[PDB]
């Protein structure tokens, strides 16, 4: 079996990409965070607390007749941002493009921190890291990557995030015609429950290329790419009036600037995140000043590839008995 799958931006800064899920029977439609960075799939529902809902579609247990409660089940997760959501567990018919899981654990929220809430776009995360990071108890559960991974054509999903612009999550399939040139697969370690690879080295608009390990996570979760300081540096270098403001919270540059490109290697390969990517705007309505795209990984603990690295890709993520992921340009 295959799926496919639009994913769409929420706003015009690529904050992060919806895409829709149907849930129980008949098929709810919920608008899921596709987030390879976590291994739950939760749901604003008609359990969350009322006063946390403002907007959001809610998935409804009593209208679906698969729906099952898992008895003693709950569930709590922090992300890396802060925010956070918990509740108890159903298991449910979920399809997605056209893939169908059967008894697929639907975590449904009765809590969710204020930045979900202000969030009226994202129904809900839908996790594509491994399913050992899942936070259920006291039965972890599977990811849905992991329960339709043995009926997929091929036990892999990819990720074509667009620059403000529609893209595609695909599952069991490689689309060869959404790419350019070759793809370059890279090793994983799952060891800490991610898709953790190690990149190659960096380059800053037209410079050399600098040799460099530089392990971190490709997460579609993760709006920036978070990098060590000194590589981040190297870059906001190059772009006069360039700063890191403490009481914004990361690097701004004025907003009149061009930015330069930012290239990250993937084995003897190049992926080039043009400088356009790495603008995130006004850092409040009407402000000259700019958020940067590209902030340090200091206190995070672990560089994260998330969306503006791999917008500029396409990615496979392959779930083979040992994983690896693909890189090519687009």
């Known amino acids: ?120 776009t994202i129904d809900g995360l839908l996790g594509l890291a491994f399913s050992t990071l899942n936070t259920v108890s006291p039965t972890q559960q599977k990811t849905f990557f992991d329960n339709a991974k043995a009926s997929l054509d091929s036990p892999v999903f990819t990720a074509d995030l667009g620059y403000h612009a529609p893209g595609t999550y695909n599952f069991g399939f490689i689309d060869t015609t959404a790419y350019t040139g070759s793809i370059t697969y890279t090793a994983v370690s799952t060891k800490q ?18 040799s460099t390990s530089i392990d ?39 907003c009149s600037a061009t930015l330069p490109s930012f290239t990250f290697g993937v084995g003897s390969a190049r992926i080039v995140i043009p400088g356009d990517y790495i603008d995130f705007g006004p850092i409040s309505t009407g402000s000259s000043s700019c958020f940067g795209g590209i902030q340090s990984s200091a206190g995070i603990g672990i560089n994260i590839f998330g969306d503006v690295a791999l917008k500029a890709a396409f990615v496979v993520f392959n779930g083979a008995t040992t994983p690896t992921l693909g890189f090519a340009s687009k």
């Not at 991610?194 to 608009?205: H, K, L």
């Not at 009036?241 to 690097?251: C, H, T």
Request: aromatic letters at 10%; proline letters at 3%.
């Open 1 to 120: 079996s295959t799926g496919s799958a639009t994913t769409t931006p929420i706003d015009s800064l690529d904050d992060a990409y919806i895409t829709p899920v149907q849930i129980g029977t008949p098929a709810q439609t919920l608008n899921l965070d596709f987030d390879t960075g976590s291994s739950d799939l939760w749901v604003f529902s008609s359990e969350t607390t009322a006063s946390e809902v403002d907007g959001q579609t809610i998935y409804t247990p009593s209208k679906s007749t698969t729906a099952k409660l898992l008895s003693g089940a709950t569930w709590s997760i922090s992300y890396g941002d802060g925010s956070s959501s918990s509740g108890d567990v159903y298991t449910d018919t979920v399809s997605v493009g056209g893939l169908t899981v059967t008894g697929q654990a639907v975590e449904s929220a009765k809590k969710v921190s204020s930045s979900f809430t202000e969030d009226s």
């Open 193 to 210: 429950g991610f898709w953790e690879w190690t990149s190659t080295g960096y380059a800053v608009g037209s410079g050399t290329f600098k």
């Open 216 to 254: 971190g996570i490709a997460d579609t979760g993760t709006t920036l790419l978070y990098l060590p300081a000194t590589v981040v540096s190297a870059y906001w270098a190059q772009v006069s009036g360039a700063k890191s403001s403490s009481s914004v919270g990361g690097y701004v540059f004025p």
